[PDB]
Every structure is written in C-alpha cells, then in structure tokens.
Amino acid sequence: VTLCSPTEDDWPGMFLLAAASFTDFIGPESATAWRTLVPTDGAVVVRDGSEVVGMALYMDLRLTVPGEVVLPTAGLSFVAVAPTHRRRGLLRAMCAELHRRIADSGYPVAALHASEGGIYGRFGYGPATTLHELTVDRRFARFHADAPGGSSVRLVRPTEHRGEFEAIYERWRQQVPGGLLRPQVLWDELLAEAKAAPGGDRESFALLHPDGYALYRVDRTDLKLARVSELRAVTADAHCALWRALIGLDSMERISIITHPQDPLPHLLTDTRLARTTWRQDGLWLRIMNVPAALEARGYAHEVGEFSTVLEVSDGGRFALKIGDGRARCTPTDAAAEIEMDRDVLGSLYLGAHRASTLAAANRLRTKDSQLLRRLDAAFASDVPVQTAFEF
Amino acid sequence: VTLCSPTEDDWPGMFLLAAASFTDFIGPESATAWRTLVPTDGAVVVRDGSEVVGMALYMDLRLTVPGEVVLPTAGLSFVAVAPTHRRRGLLRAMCAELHRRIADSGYPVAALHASEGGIYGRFGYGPATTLHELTVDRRFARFHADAPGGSSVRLVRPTEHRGEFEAIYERWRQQVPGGLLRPQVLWDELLAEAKAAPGGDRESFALLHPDGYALYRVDRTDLKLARVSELRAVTADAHCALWRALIGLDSMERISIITHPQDPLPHLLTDTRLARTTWRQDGLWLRIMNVPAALEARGYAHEVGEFSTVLEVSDGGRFALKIGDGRARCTPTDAAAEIEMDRDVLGSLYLGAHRASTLAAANRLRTKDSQLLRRLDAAFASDVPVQTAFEF
Amino acid sequence: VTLCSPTEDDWPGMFLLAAASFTDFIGPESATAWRTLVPTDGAVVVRDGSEVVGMALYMDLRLTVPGEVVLPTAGLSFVAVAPTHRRRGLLRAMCAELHRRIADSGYPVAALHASEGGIYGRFGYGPATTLHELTVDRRFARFHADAPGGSSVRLVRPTEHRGEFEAIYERWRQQVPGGLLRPQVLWDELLAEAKAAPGGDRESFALLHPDGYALYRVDRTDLKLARVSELRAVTADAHCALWRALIGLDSMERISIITHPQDPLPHLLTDTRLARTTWRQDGLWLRIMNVPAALEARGYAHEVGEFSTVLEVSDGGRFALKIGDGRARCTPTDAAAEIEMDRDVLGSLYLGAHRASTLAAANRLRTKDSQLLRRLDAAFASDVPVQTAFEF
Amino acid sequence: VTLCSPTEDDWPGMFLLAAASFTDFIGPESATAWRTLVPTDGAVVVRDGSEVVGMALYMDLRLTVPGEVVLPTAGLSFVAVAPTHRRRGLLRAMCAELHRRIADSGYPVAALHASEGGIYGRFGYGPATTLHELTVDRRFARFHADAPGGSSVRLVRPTEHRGEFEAIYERWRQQVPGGLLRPQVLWDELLAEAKAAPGGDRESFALLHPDGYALYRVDRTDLKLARVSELRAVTADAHCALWRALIGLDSMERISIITHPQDPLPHLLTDTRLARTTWRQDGLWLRIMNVPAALEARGYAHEVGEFSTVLEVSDGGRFALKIGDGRARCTPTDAAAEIEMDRDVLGSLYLGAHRASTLAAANRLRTKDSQLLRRLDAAFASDVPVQTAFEF
Numbered sequence A, B, C, D: 001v002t003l004c005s006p007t008e009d010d011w012p013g014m015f016l017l018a019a020a021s022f023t024d025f026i027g028p029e030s031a032t033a034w035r036t037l038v039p040t041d042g043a044v045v046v047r048d049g050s051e052v053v054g055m056a057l058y059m060d061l062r063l064t065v066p067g068e069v070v071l072p073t074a075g076l077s078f079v080a081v082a083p084t085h086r087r088r089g090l091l092r093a094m095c096a097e098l099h100r101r102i103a104d105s106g107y108p109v110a111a112l113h114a115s116e117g118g119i120y121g122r123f124g125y126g127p128a129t130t131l132h133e134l135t136v137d138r139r140f141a142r143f144h145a146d147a148p149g150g151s152s153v154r155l156v157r158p159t160e161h162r163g164e165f166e167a168i169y170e171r172w173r174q175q176v177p178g179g180l181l182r183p184q185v186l187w188d189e190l191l192a193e194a195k196a197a198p199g200g201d202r203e204s205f206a207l208l209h210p211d212g213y214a215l216y217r218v219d220r221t222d223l224k225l226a227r228v229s230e231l232r233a234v235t236a237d238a239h240c241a242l243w244r245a246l247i248g249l250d251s252m253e254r255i256s257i258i259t260h261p262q263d264p265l266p267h268l269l270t271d272t273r274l275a276r277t278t279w280r281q282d283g284l285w286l287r288i289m290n291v292p293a294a295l296e297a298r299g300y301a302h303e304v305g306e307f308s309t310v311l312e313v314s315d316g317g318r319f320a321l322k323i324g325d326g327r328a329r330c331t332p333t334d335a336a337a338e339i340e341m342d343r344d345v346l347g348s349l350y351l352g353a354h355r356a357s358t359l360a361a362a363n364r365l366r367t368k369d370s371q372l373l374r375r376l377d378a379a380f381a382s383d384v385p386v387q388t389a390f391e392f
C-alpha cells in the first residue's frame, strides 16, 4: 500500500476507479481537457503492491475573493477510494500529501466540491458558498412596476455565440466572490453537454444580452420544467431582462435555477413567494493553506472602524490581526488569543457566506468579547454577495 | 354595501365567514381569547344592505425591533371577503379604514401574516421575517467536538410547566427582533392545541432547560417524523442542550422545525448538510405607519460611522436621515432625495431580514450612490438575527 | 337455504351483514329514515337454516323521465351476500323474487346504483345516467364576456335554510330526467353528513340563489380542494351565479363536482380546458319491468316525423311501436321484428344517455334499417340533458 | 418589427424558434415533408428589424364534415412567438394576416390544434372535436355474448403493409366527420415514429383486418401498458375484431387509446366500466371563414322538418337560414336576428360535437325561442359521430 505520483501506466487504473466512483463520468475525452489543468506533481495514487485503489489530484484555478482580488487556488478533484479499500486511511494519507505539495508550491487556499457533507471538515475545509435552488411557477409571475425593462435579449444557439458567453463570464468572475477563471477546455465541455443526447438531455438554448446570458433546457422527464444550467449577469438590467425572457417561456409551468441566497429575482415579482426555495446545499469548500497570506489578500468592509485582535487557528498559528480602511495586516504573536477557531471555520467566513456570530453560537468560533464578534461579522461581510462559479 | 364597526348582532355573521374562509378555525371558544386583544374600534365589517360579506380587525401587540426596543404594533388578522363579493374593492376599503384608525391611534407600525404573497405589498406591507424549515435526518446526526454540553434538559408535560415556558418566552421575546408579547389567552390556546385530538394531532411533549424549551409532537400520518412546534432558547447552551435531546428521539427518523435562516443548528453537527432546508416563506409583514417614529425608534449598527442622507418614501414623506452611535434622527426636508423606495420596502428592511443592496438590484430601492447603499446595508443590519414569534 | 320476507328478529343479522358489506354504513339511526321508504313486502333475506347470509330490498321512489313525466320506480338497495356464501346463486334468487314482487305490484321500472359494473346487466339493468367529475383549476378561471351575471348568491349554513333547499330541489327533480323525489328522511340524512365529524369530514357551507344552491366542503386531506357535494340550478342564471361564487373561493386551488356530460360550466370560461374531466362512471341503472307502459309513459322528440316499427325485447315481448307528436303507442304483435335488443339496452336508451347507434355498433341493438336507427336515436334523445339525482 | 412572407434566408431562424417552442420537434428532415403542404404565400414571420421572433403558417388540408362532404381547409400550424417578444401583439398580427390570405384564397374553414385552451377563441376558433382517452384493465375484460366475431386479424410490421393502412385510412377519412386526407409525406413520418428509438419509444406493431387497423406499442417506462397510437375501422366488425386482438395482449395489464366520446368499445364488454375515461380534451378547432359557404356545404339531419330562422354571427354577417331535406340555404338579410353567436360558437357546432342547447345555457348562443334551439340541436347533430383524424 504505497502512495506515489502516477506514471502513464497508472492512468487506465485511475479511469476505471473514476467510472466506478463518479456517475457524471463521460470517459477519457473530457480527460484531455481536465488533465491540462493538473500541474506536474498535482496527482497521487495508492497502489495495492498491483492496481490503483485510491487517487486524488488538484487543478490550478483562479478564485475571486472579496475586494475583486484573484487568488491562485488549488482545486481538489477526482478523489476516490476503491470500495475494496475503505477504512484504511487512504483519503487521509492522499489529502496529507496533496496539502504538503500545495503549501510548498505557494497556494494560499485550496478548494473542492464535496460529494458528502461529513468528510472534509476534519481536513480543514469549510463550506464557503451556498447553492440555493429557486423554482418559479411562471404561470402566475408578473413583474413589479419598479422592475427594469418594462427586447435587448435574443434567443440563440449556444455553439454560435461561444465568444460572447466567454467574454460575459470573464467579466462576471472578476467582479464576484466565488468567481473562477473558466479555461478553454471547460468551455469545450460546457458546449458538449449543451447538445441533445439520444436517451439523455434535450437541446440547450441561450438567452443573450450585451451584459448577461442564461443557458436553459427542458427537463428530460418533465416537459413543463425548464432548468437554467447557468445565468451570468454583470448588471441588474441584464439580470431582469434575462428573467423577463425566461418568464416568457409560455409552454413551461416552472423555471428552476441553482443560484445564491441573495438572488434579487423574488423582488422583481409582485408575489415574492412565487420564487420558491426547493433546495439548499454547500457549494465551494475552502481550506486556508496560509492564514496570514489569505487574511491579508482579501478586502474587508470600509464601514467598520479600525480594530486589532489576536486570532488563533487550531494548529494553524496565532496572529495579531489589525483591520482598517478595508485592509488587514496579519503578523505572528505569542500574545493571548482573543479569538480561537479551527481552520475550516476561517474558510467558511472567508467569502462572507457565513457570519462569525452564527459560528460563535455553535461554539465553532470562541471569544469572550461580543463587540469583537460584531466587528468580525461586519469586516468579513462581502459588499457583492458570494456566488458559486462551476463544479469541479 | 356599507363599511362600519361591527355591533354584537354582526358577530355570528363574522364567525360564519370565518369558518368558510379559514381552515385552522376552531369555533367561538378561541373567540373569547382573541377578542380581548381587539381594541374598541379595532374591527370593520362590510354588510350587503343584509349579511356580513367582509371583515377585518387589528389586535394590540408589542413587537421587539433591533436594539431590544418594543413598539406598540397593530396586528391585522381575521381578514376575509365572502366568495360572493370578490373584485368589489372590499379588501382595499377595509384596509384604508383600519390604516386611518391605526395611524390616528398613534401606532408607528402595523403587522400581519399573509395567506398569499401577492396581496399586501400594494397596501404598504413588506415581508420582514423569513420562515426556514430544517428537516434533520437524526439517524446520521453526530454533534461536533466543539458543540457545548458534551442532562440539564427534562422531558415534561407542557400543561404542568406553563409558568416556566411563560417566563422563558418572555425573556426570549424582549431580546429578539420579531419577538411578540404572548398574552395569557394565547398561552391558553397553545396548551389546548398541545393535547391529543381524536382523529387529529398526537399529544405534545416538552423538553425544558432553565434557559430554553422545545414543544414537539409526532406527526399524524408519519410516525417517524417529530415536528417541533416551537423552540425558544435564551442562551447558546440551552439551544445546543435542547437539540442534543431532540436528536435523542431514537424512535424518530426525522426532526422538522420552522426556524430562521441564521439558526446555528447545522454548525452543531459534523455534517452540516444533515440540517436540510425543506421550505422557506415570508413570516411577519410590516407596514411602517409613521416613517420618522419607526426609523428613530430602532437601534442601528455601531460599526458604521455617522452619515446623513435624504430618504423619500413614495407618498410617505421625504426626510433628512442622520444615523450615528447606533441612533437615527429623521426630520422633514424638501431637499433633493438621495434614496427613494415604496413603504413596503422600508418594512422589509426594518428588522434586518432583507439587505438594501438586494432590493436595490431589483430597483425596489433607488440611489445613484453605491457608498450610501453599503452604509444603509450595514446600519439596518441586526446584530441579533430576526426570528418569527407566532402567527396571528 | 330458504328465501323469505324478513321478520323483526331478522333485522339485527341484516345490519351485521350491512356493516360488513358497505363502508358508507353509519349504523341503525339512518335505518329509521330509509326503512320508511321500504314497503311492506319490499325486502327478502336468505337464512342458512340459522343467520342471515343474503338480503335485498326495494324502496318506493318517483323518477322523472323525458317529457317531465314522473314514474313510480322500485329502487333496489341494501343488496348483500355474506362472503361465506358466494357462488350459491343467492343474488340471482333474491333479484328474481324482488322482480316478481315489483312487476306484480305494478311498477313500470326498477332502478339501482351498482357497486360493480359487471353484475346487473344479466338481470335486465342498463346504465341510464353518466356521472362526470369536473375539476376546475380556479386560479386561472376567468368568466367569458358572454357569461350571465357580470350578488344574488349568499354564503349560508345549510341547517338554517333546509326549507329553501327542499323547495329548489323539488323544482329541479320535476323538470330534469333522472330527478328523484327526495323524502324528509333523506334531507335529515343530508344535513347530518353536512356537519363536521371528529377525524372525518369538514363542515359544509352552502351558496344559496333564489333558483339554485351548491353544498361544498373542503376535502379532509387536501385543504386546497373544495368538493361540491351537490349543485341544483333551475335556471342558467342560477348555475352561472353559483359558479361565479365557487370560483371566488380564493383560498382553494381546485373545485371538483360530480355532474353530467352536458354541464355548461366549461363554456362559462375563456379557457374551456380548465374544467378537466377527472372521472366518468355509470350513475343510475334502469330495468324496464313493463315495456309497453314504460315506452308509452315518456315523451319523445317532436322534431322526428311519425314512424312505425316492431321492437322485440329478448324474453320481454314483441311490440308494434308507433312514435309521433312526441308520444308512443306500443301494442302486442307477432309481425316480424325490425329491432331486437336485450331488456338492459332499453333501460340504457330510456333517459337518453346512450344513443341507439352506439349500442347498434356494439351489436347490443340489431336492425337491418339504418334510417330506423337514425329515427330511434332522434326520438329517444332528451331535450333536457339527463342528470343523476342522488345515490341510494 | 415588420411582418412578411419568409425568404429562404428566414428558414434557419424559424427552425431555431421551432426547436425552442415545440418539444415534439425532430429537426429539418420532417421539414421537407410538411413544407410541401404549405402553399406559396402560406407563411408569415416577424423580424426584429434582425432575427425571426414570430412565425405562423397554414397547410392545404381536406376535412370531412357531416354528409361526407370534403372542404378545402386551411390548417394553421408551426405558430410560435419568441419568449423575448411576448405581449407585443405578434400572435394577433400574424393571425390577422393569415386569415386575410386564407379568406382571399377561398377557404371556407380554417382549423388548428391548440397548445392551450385560452388562446384561439378570441380569433374565431371553436373546439369542434373531443379527444377521449379510454384505459381498459384488459385482465378483467370479457366480450359480451352479443359482440361480433365470437381470426380475420393479423399481427404485422407496419412498414410491410403501408399500402393497406393507406387504403383503409382513405376509406375512413371520407366517411367520418373530422376526417383529414393524410398525404404521402405524413405516412412517411408515421412509419418513422413506428420504429424503436434508442432511449426513446419501443417498436410499434399493427393489427390488420380487411376493414381496419390498430397501431400500438408498449409504453417506455410502463411495460404493462400498450398505447394504441391509432385505430381506424370502416365497419363495426373490424372495430370489434381489432379489440378482441388488443384484449389478447396477455402480457399487458392496460390498453390505452385516444378515441372519441361515442367509441362503442365499452358496450362490447360485460363490464362497461372496464373502459375507464382517464382524459378528455379539445381536439380540432374550427374557424368558419365564410358562414354561408360553410353552412350550405354540410348535410343536416333529415329527421327535423323544414324550418327558417335568422342567424347573426358577431362581426360575421346576418343570414336567412332555411334547413330542410338535410340541406341549408343561407342568404344575406337585414331582418331581425332570431339567433346570435360569436364565430367560435359556430365552429364548435359545425361537426356536431357540441349541442346548441349546451352553448345557449352558457349564453354563448342567444335566442328567445326554445323550439328553434331544439331544431338547431337536431339539424346540426351528426348521424356518424365526429372523430379526430391526426394532430398538425
């Protein structure tokens, strides 16, 4: 039971474990695409001796955090342990080795999407974005008198406007916390999935505005449901225009989208209740690799006045943290801690999705100063609400 | 088609329209209870000539708003138009007359629970609290190592500990935005509903801590589901202790509760995803009757520095609004408006449930200054998350 | 295994078999009511020796047939064979004896409601009315510009307007084919079922017009469904007014009614499709006891010119049938048959629910003359569409 | 926003809007087929400037009406407005232009199948046929002793007997109201849909009689349900023989068919209730383009004696209407109207699906003479029950 970087001879064993572990799994054509994102020592395998019984890798990503700051981010993916080798510590050993390599390589953060919610907390990952599904009964939906755009939107084939989607998405990712650079190879895959599959998904159409797009398709089994796979809007006007067009899908009963908790959609309608929350789940998980580099890198709210505290991360260091004029300075200290929390809690607070006070109520964040808690809450808040870019 | 205060002879016609309009409706024994809360000129009826075809009333309530400030609040309830008299403007005429009486009586706010989401916006009511149902698959739930109370909780009969529930609830309502004084007569009704009904609900039990209680019952049809009707916890320790006891209902598969978006429950567990959001809806709706009295009455966040603006409410006045040291001064002005919004939008922002930026994205709040928007957001935020007291 | 009229000592054994055979079965309080309708020799029981293993009876009823003619009608009911005595010919023997008594007593027709569709055909009964359930999605329902009554309807308690329902129902039954006289004791039972039952049905309300009424209640399990138990309208204006009021049940999603195929409801709306047919079944079954007395008694369409034919009923006689000026003369003959059909087919054609041509296509009605078939079709048609009065 | 006949360059924009608007939509291979049926100026498009945002066309069809008379019929199809251009009057403008062209071209009637029931009434279209789904629990089905054919039916592959289906269908359409000529290109499409699709429908089989055929297939998800796509029988013997064979599908639990209200199937069985009505909906919609040409063209019932009246169609002319010996003469007059109705009501009465009395009860047809109403009812009735040919 040895742990190594894979050789070319290991990859067929990895694709076998992939097919058996992941239901989304196409086959080794999307492998050319995603492999480019994996750097030279970005993968580990466990062999028994001798076949592949475990694998994990990271991709080179670019993540937007509050203040429109873009961090090099190690994106863990393709994580699998053979069903024959459970409870042997393989996941723990693979995560320890990748974290060592990520830290040494100079990444301030790592990120992942979690197949289950109980695994990655113990490895320092905290849920950092929230997926919010809205289902609109569009037969009753009337726009409020105040709603913009009372058309600049066109109904188009996705494949014929790749360049415009690419340009709108690039503008969106730079300005929104949670934003990820989407490389050419993931656009190739997005348009692949957008064409009809025999006994699979129906054709996708696009609604295209100068400052936004929506990709949608009719559900396989339900022909009265349109699923919005993705809506990226750089302006409020674009967002409202796109929703006017989606509510115009007159043959549909329901429009569903996976969005964020602060989606203004409900406020565009005379009946806010028509935008029903049908599902909520953790999106992106963050592990802060380097506490001072992460805390210094992001912007903080300008509204809160300068304050100083001492933050301890459990087995992650203790730091003099000074926050003012929307900037943090974060320096080593042995002075007494005023705030203690595990590494995962800091990742949950990093993009502004979770309030420090809510975590403090659960005892995940500990302080004897309620004023410092209100100050953390306000400082770590995000002006621009955090969204989920794409699963990886 | 005349609109008057009811006489004693009108009340049987009102109870008939009630039975036909409301499915929750017991009969005129809960009528003795709720009638005490209705002040002398707190009810209107519409007669055709000549039976009752429309009715509406308000109750005298006490609502906690941010800063632990308690406002006299007019609670609209028992609103009904006969199915024979729809589209005759009866609701509009009844609301106009009650609002006139409420304003003249000196109430700064009115409140209601909405049977549908598309009605009350046009009468100046904005949804001000959010109901969030969590369903816990308690068979998988393990408490986090950080969770307090790793018992001070007793399993009791509700009827034998009325006094302790009353005392814990009183402490909770005073310290939480959304809190309502619960009068003796609504405690009488709560314990009535807590006893088993033949072909109705199962018996309710209570979990009692010095600083919290939960009322729960097994579902009628589903014997593996326990429904928490109400959990009031004054301390984090009480909340965690009560949830340790609810997760100990070993014969149940699922625990469901209607709570608020900031309920720390998910953070108490090793798998946050086990606390699934199964339902979200508007709770309390607010109509600000007097803008300056409401805006001056509540506390604002101390973290945001002193600022000055001009707020216009559409057909509600224009005001010089100065906010600093957590207090607002709100005075008449004819100076140019920097912020415009309808009366309903102000009610939605009053308890801190909705961000000004989210409403601005929908064009419900209008400003040409993004800095003023961040300042409104931070100032109107609530340190203590807003909760829903009880339906009326 | 003897077949007799019951004695007083037989009735407890009959109520036992009733409880075990019928799920609708209240107990012997509705027995006082229905027993009055049973004439002196109107019941048979089968004893084994020695308990009751079979029973059947008829009631004295008054049935409206085309031409507003009212026939004495023997209504079979309370028919049951013990589960211990199936396949012993008990039903056949009980039906043969009751038919002998009914024929000898001078009834021209017998009638029943069938628990299953495959039993009573072989005893000469044909389905004669059609139950048609409409479910209206009332949230989309808009009345057509042409619809009358663009209120004369009141929302009332059934128990307080018994006399007005009685008077409207009496007018309806006399003018509609399928109409039955409803005696005092069946009004007693109707109002019993109209009050709320603990763990049973919700309270019933009434919509009362000078020329019509609807009884409705909210469904037990579904609180968004109102079930119309009964709507009797003497004029088109009443029918439309009552439906305007039912569509005003704003808290309901759906209104369901068991009506007839020619209910004009769909034509009152801008979208006829909103009145969905959710269920269709046979209502009243007729056995013609005396062919000449039945055929002479009813009115025929005045539009068809005088014609003469020879009708044979299989083991029921052969008759010279002359139809003109809406009257039939029906006299014995040994001349060659031009039309043959079983007794059940004549019952199906008697109230105009089933066309002769449709039965001829199935070979239930046989003729070598297609002109005679068109003539039968037109003559047996009913100006006033046939409806179902009440189950017995 | 201009409205024109499409050019070749418009057709790709039309196929895009088609794919997005219609879920049945194969792609531009069925386009070669259906395009032949579209005459030279039979299509309109709306451009924004500049892409296609709206389209509509008609096909040249041949519709059988009562009296076995075949009318040139303009069949509206491929009607779509882009979801970006709702509420701009595009449908109204496209329908006005096509109606102008259809009227000028000399079509007495237009027809369509409606995606929703609330659209086409306001454009003069009335539902003229009724779709009736029967589901037979074939495990209980026994044929009545009177049922013909107590085999002349063969189980065959559709593709190998195209010529025999074509010949049987041609005989059926000529003799049945609702019948449409089915051109070569729609037979090409029918056999395309009859072969198994990977992840789509199962193979179709045929039951072939000299005077009838049934096409059926096992349902995708339900393997105990056989769906009859089409059953055309020229004789009663063929219809019964085909149903004997379908009831012989011993591996099936249920047989479902979309048929008409007068399908004799239920009468072929000992238990009529086994043929359950699971669904009812409008089939073909008719707009009478020229009232006198339509009313003169069809046959009327010979049973009703000669009568004369004055019919007004709202904005459609007033006419002296004389009906006798199954023929109508329909001439201009300014004499007082005895009957008024909108154009849509006449289309609903044209094929005999809807009675004048039922429409009169809804006030869609207005007269002060009840005798004239009985006369209209009998005269417009159809000897041969109206059926639905095929969707377009």
Ligand SMILES: O[C@H](c1cc(C(F)(F)F)nc2c(C(F)(F)F)cccc12)[C@@H]1CCCCN1
Binding pocket: A015, A018, A022, A024, A025, A026, A027, A028, A029, A030, A031, A032, A033, A034, A035, A038, A057, A077, A078, A392
């Ligand atoms: O589809 C993504 C993916 C696929 C494949 C493929 F199966 F095509 F070879 N290879 C991936 C790789 C690769 F193995 F390095 F190529 C890295 C990251 C994601 C990959 C994964 C699959 C499961 C978990 C989330 N996305």
Ligand SMILES: O[C@H](c1cc(C(F)(F)F)nc2c(C(F)(F)F)cccc12)[C@@H]1CCCCN1
Binding pocket: B015, B018, B022, B024, B025, B026, B027, B028, B029, B030, B031, B032, B033, B034, B035, B038, B057, B077, B078, B392
């Ligand atoms: O149960 C509450 C209530 C009941 C009754 C009763 F039906 F017992 F006479 N009366 C109420 C009254 C009363 F009519 F003034 F007594 C006011 C407010 C709420 C009442 C309402 C009923 C429906 C809407 C929300 N709570």
Ligand SMILES: O[C@H](c1cc(C(F)(F)F)nc2c(C(F)(F)F)cccc12)[C@@H]1CCCCN1
Binding pocket: C015, C018, C022, C024, C025, C026, C027, C028, C029, C030, C031, C032, C033, C034, C035, C038, C057, C077, C078, C392
């Ligand atoms: O409720 C009707 C009914 C009830 C009862 C009762 F159970 F109350 F004694 N007795 C009935 C009688 C009676 F037995 F003669 F009293 C006749 C007809 C219907 C009766 C029946 C019961 C099942 C079949 C249709 N209606």
Ligand SMILES: O[C@H](c1cc(C(F)(F)F)nc2c(C(F)(F)F)cccc12)[C@@H]1CCCCN1
Binding pocket: D015, D018, D022, D024, D025, D026, D027, D028, D029, D030, D031, D032, D033, D034, D035, D038, D057, D077, D078, D392
């Ligand atoms: O399938 C029928 C149809 C298809 C197509 C196709 F998409 F193949 F090019 N073209 C049609 C045309 C055509 F566009 F003129 F070719 C006319 C009428 C029906 C057509 C339509 C499609 C939706 C509404 C009812 N039948």
